[PDB]
Amino acid sequence: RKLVEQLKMEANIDRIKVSKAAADLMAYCEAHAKEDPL
Amino acid sequence: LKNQIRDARKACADATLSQITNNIDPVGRIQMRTRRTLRGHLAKIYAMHWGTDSRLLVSASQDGKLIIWDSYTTNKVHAIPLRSSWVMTCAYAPSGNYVACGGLDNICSIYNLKVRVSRELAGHTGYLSCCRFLDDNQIVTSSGDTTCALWDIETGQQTTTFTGHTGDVMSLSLAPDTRLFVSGACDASAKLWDVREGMCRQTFTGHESDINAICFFPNGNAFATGSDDATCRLFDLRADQELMTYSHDNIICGITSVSFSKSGRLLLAGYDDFNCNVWDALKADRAGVLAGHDNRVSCLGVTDDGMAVATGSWDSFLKIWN
Amino acid sequence: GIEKQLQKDKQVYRATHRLLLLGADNSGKSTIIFETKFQVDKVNFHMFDVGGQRDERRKWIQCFNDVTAIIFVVDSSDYNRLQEALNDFKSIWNNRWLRTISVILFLNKQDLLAEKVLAYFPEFARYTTPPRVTRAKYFIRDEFLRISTASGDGRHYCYPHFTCAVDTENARRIFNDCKDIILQMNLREYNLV
Amino acid sequence: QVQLQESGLRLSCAASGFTFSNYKMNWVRQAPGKGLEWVSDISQSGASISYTGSVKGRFTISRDNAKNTLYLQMNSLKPEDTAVYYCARCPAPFTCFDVTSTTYAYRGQGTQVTV
Amino acid sequence: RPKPQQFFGLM
Amino acid sequence: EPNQFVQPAWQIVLWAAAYTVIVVTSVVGNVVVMWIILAHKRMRTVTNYFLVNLAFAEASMAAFNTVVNFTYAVHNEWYYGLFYCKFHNFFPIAAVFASIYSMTAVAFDRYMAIIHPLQPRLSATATKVVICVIWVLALLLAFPQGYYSTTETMPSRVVCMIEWPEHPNKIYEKVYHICVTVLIYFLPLLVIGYAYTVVGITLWAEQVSAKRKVVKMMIVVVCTFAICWLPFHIFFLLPYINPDLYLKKFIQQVYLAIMWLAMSSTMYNPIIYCCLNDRFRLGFKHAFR
User: Fold this and answer.
1) A29: nearest CA in chain B?
2) Which residues of D touch B209 (CB under 8 A)?
3) Which subunits have 3 or more CB–CB pairs within 8 Å of chain C?
4) Which terminus has fewer CB within 10 Å in chain D: N or C?
5) Torsion-angle region of residue B34: left (phi > 0), alpha (psi -120 to 50) or beta?
6) Which residues of chain F does C4 touch, with a Cβ-Cβ cutoff of 8 Å?
7) Could you say which residues are annotated as the site Cleavage (chain E)?
8) Is A1-38 a CATH 3.30.530.20 domain?
9) CB neighbours of F256 closer than 8 A, spacing ≥ 6?
């Protein structure tokens, strides 16, 4: 029954759309590409 | 209640990550070669960690040796004989004053480098799989009894305990802000934990077999997981879904170590096919092949400012690539 | 003096032979984590019995990839848990990281097996020795030998033994078996076969 | 998220969350008052089939990769066969230790069978 | 040197 | 009549074919074995260091010694001068001695690996030390023949020979030849025979056939070594009991026969490695494609 309480605690979170997260990931990747020696 | 979670995850899925990175310029072929080769260990290398000064590193072998290497000159600054021959992890402190190790003895041994042993944390039940320093006084460890723990080094007592996994915990990764961490375990799931609170935040279930390694993206909002299903996966903490899946039709072996670069463009994945791959994190396409080990690549690490990538395998050799 | 003092330790790592001890609760493997060091003919063998972890063994058994031999102890008198011992033997034999390590098989508790004979497997009726105790002993031995000769015979071999609780010559057998285990390794390393 | 759901004389095990054609599938009972005991196994392509000697010649195990399900056809039962049955998957594809374990994450909740 | 009919074999 | 040992052309053709076959077989087999071990990066092992030392010594032996000695034995005329006379009496003789000592070291490896397998192997630095000692004593034993070497001009003849210090009883050359005959024939034959006899007795008493093939290989190695190196030392100890045999062409026929017999032992070890190990067979197939 503790797993149900954990699922209820983790369910009520703010889920932003995946396109905005992909855009933020790509923006951080592009903003630091010049100082990556690899 | 998980049906509502999956329904919300489907409703928050607008477009794929590869669609957002579709009309972008690829990196291309990555050509890397071995600069320094370290040969001072007898048995297989099980783990390593880089220093924050980007010069000295540490390495652990199954013969009972923990050797601190100078990567610039291929010289051994320190060599420590261990009381237990089986060590599965090692961590090097950000201040450089301490080192830690642990393994099948179920003890987290912390040594001072002013080399003398300083502390022996003994509260775990299963085999200690990973450990990472927060400060010189606190440390986050994970063991094979499906638990993690935050410890105070001074009193030698557990401060908090993280018990949410149903499988043996294989790896952990610390956030750069030192307020959260992630753990990957043997139930095909990864979990995010709060250091200050002591409770799990979110649970990610996208894999199909035992997850062996985990590493944050450099911005702290994403991570990557490698497992035994021959696929890597990139997850985001905000989108609540797997952003990317790095797979191939010819890889049928497990994944032992993953790590990120300075910009997060390249994902560096160690495999059981005697070689490592360099994937593109955005394009989800393989861009480099590093093949210089005659046995299974056990551990992999990235220099803190991105000047080198050091791998260690079961052929008792450490190789630095640039 | 890091580089010199390591090298002598390499000689110590060239001096000892590591062994992995496996068995169930009913098998007397403590009589045959804990470390036991014993010296036969001025050769040091160092056996490890692991009991401090959980019953899931698929992740730490890879720590014993470079071990010389696996001593597997089976209580032969327990007919109820004999299939579990056979499944454990099959798992150790067919592992990917244990496909090059030979297994010395010790069929312990011979006197209780003889008492159970003189007082599960339907194929026992159509069996003949290659006098009931001898038939039971060799049926139990051939049950493991069928798994041993089913696959992976070229890379590693099995060495069965019959052992009682008052037996003292097990270190002799471990010495002789490890001597043949590397002898076959040295015959292929030195371009002879 | 992997999922195995049992139903059930013929027991069925429906699989989800993972590809089915690359794993070896096992049937494991648990008797009332006794521990978990391995019963049967079938390989990835359905070639190598093994049974315990107590049920040899009496049980059949089959798989359907088109429907991604695992069947156990059981007949001529005995009163000792009353147990809780689970379908188990070992984690490494193209290969298998801990399917008969106390806390295993890659097996279902099982079904009760009373004879 | 002793004779012009000598063989002078070498290894 | 102005000079004997001038063979007719058909004898030169027959000896040229019989020597060309063995020098081509020897040098091709030895350089393929060296390339197999040193190029594949998995055969580069502490075990095979004595093997590549033996292969290099045998190849240098075959090429330099057999070609120069056949050229000097066709017409008994020297075409190379004083410096190459000294070099030929210094270096290929040391290659002979280093090859025999390297084969003794390989037999020692086999004895230690088979009779005492639980004991650890020699270190890489110890292996390099034994290689250095073998080559140093090989050059030290071959030095007095290359130091006293000189050339002389006879009527229509040029000769290379060792000019020993003059003695009323020729003590120095007698002691040198008996000592080199003992140290090069008798000691390594006894050592290799004892080690191979003990190893064959152990291995002789599925997988039984491979051990018996190894025992047959060692019997073949010992027998061919003794047969191929008996008349060489018989000839080089001959002039100190009957020095009048060098006045006829029978002795150049005897010299050509014994030099073919002595230098034909170079071909034997690549064929042995090809017959025993399948990895060497795969390397021979890979090098020929």
Assistant:
1) B263
2) 91-93
3) B, D, F
4) C
5) beta
6) none
7) 2-3, 6-10
8) no
9) F15, F70, F73
